[PDB]
Amino acid sequence: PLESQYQVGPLLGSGGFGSVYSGIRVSDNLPVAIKHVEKDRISDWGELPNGTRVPMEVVLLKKVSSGFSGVIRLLDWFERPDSFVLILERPEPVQDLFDFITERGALQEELARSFFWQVLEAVRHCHNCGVLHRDIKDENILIDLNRGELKLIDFGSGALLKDTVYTDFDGTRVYSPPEWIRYHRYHGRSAAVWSLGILLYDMVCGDIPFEHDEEIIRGQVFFRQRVSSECQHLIRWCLALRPSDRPTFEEIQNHPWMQDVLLPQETAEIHLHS
Numbered sequence: 199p200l201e202s203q204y205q206v207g208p209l210l211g212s213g214g215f216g217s218v219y220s221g222i223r224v225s226d227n228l229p230v231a232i233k234h235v236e237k238d239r240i241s242d243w244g245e246l247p248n249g250t251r252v253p254m255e256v257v258l259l260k261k262v263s264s265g266f267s268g269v270i271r272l273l274d275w276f277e278r279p280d281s282f283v284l285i286l287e288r289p290e291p292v293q294d295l296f297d298f299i300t301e302r303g304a305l306q307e308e309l310a311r312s313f314f315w316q317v318l319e320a321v322r323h324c325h326n327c328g329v330l331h332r333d334i335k336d337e338n339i340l341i342d343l344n345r346g347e348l349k350l351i352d353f354g355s356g357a358l359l360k361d362t363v364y365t366d367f368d369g370t371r372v373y374s375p376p377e378w379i380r381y382h383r384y385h386g387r388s389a390a391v392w393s394l395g396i397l398l399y400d401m402v403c404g405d406i407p408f409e410h411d412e413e414i415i416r417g418q419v420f421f422r423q424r425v426s427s428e429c430q431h432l433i434r435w436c437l438a439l440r441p442s443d444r445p446t447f448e449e450i451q452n453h454p455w456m457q458d459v460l461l462p463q464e465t466a467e468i469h470l471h472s
């Protein structure tokens with residue numbers, strides 16, 4: 199037990215998710231990320247198959263661990279008297295999608311197609327494991343720059359998937375749907391689909407469409423960059439004001455704009471410099 203197992207590197211960041219450090223597992227020099235969450239800031243707890251009391255985040259992360267690389271894998275976790283510490287895999291070299299967009303601005307459609315498809319695959323995997331992420335956005339997406347594989351990260355706002363209404367939310371407001379804003383009610387899939395529309399707009403325009411409650415509620419989308427008609431249509435469909443008017447994951451992936459995606463490795467070659 200205990201961290202003498204890990205050699206702590208530099209702080210990667212800190213925020214509403216806690217404090218995350220670059221690290222290395224001493225027993226094989228495997229890159230990890232070490233994430234400390236304060237007990238005070240955990241509103242949401244569950245219990246595992248094992249059945250002890252842990253943060254919901256840990257429950258959700260265990261439900262999605264697998265060799266499938268589109269979601270971050272929890273390697274281990276530790277309790278401390280005032281915090282939980284989590285050990286997560288860390289690709290290297292790596293860059294989050296927010297920073298990549300800061301650097302390169304609006305993305306070419308072929309590249310956005312490739313990234314967005316990989317995001318769809320990740321989210322379908324989560325829904326499949328009975329998990330609803332509830333904070334899909336560019337800051338929660340890591341790009342493995344060598345392999346061109348994206349990774350969804352940060353389940354600290356997620357919940358067990360269910361088919362009844364959610365009336366609670368602690369993810370990102372500007373990615374949250376009109377129904378959350380107006381009624382504090384949404385269903386899991388359709389709220390997830392709206393945030394995927396925000397995300398895809400973000401990729402192709404270089405920023406999110408809406409900053410204020412009023413704009414979200416209005417749902418009117420203005421394109422500030424040149425974007426093909428097939429792409430604007432997919433976006434405007436993901437951002438239908440009525441939840442039931444939103445596409446399912448399968449309709450998103452059968453959309454004409456989504457055809458002939460590059461493979462992750464082709465993507466890194468053409469676009470990331472491999």
Ligand SMILES: O=C1NC(=O)/C(=C/c2cccc(C(F)(F)F)c2)S1
Nearest residue numbers: 210215218231270287288292351352
């Ligand atoms: O599941 C997760 N929850 C978080 O807050 C994470 C932060 C993180 C931030 C930058 C880099 C990485 C790294 F994995 F690349 F290191 C991880 S990961």
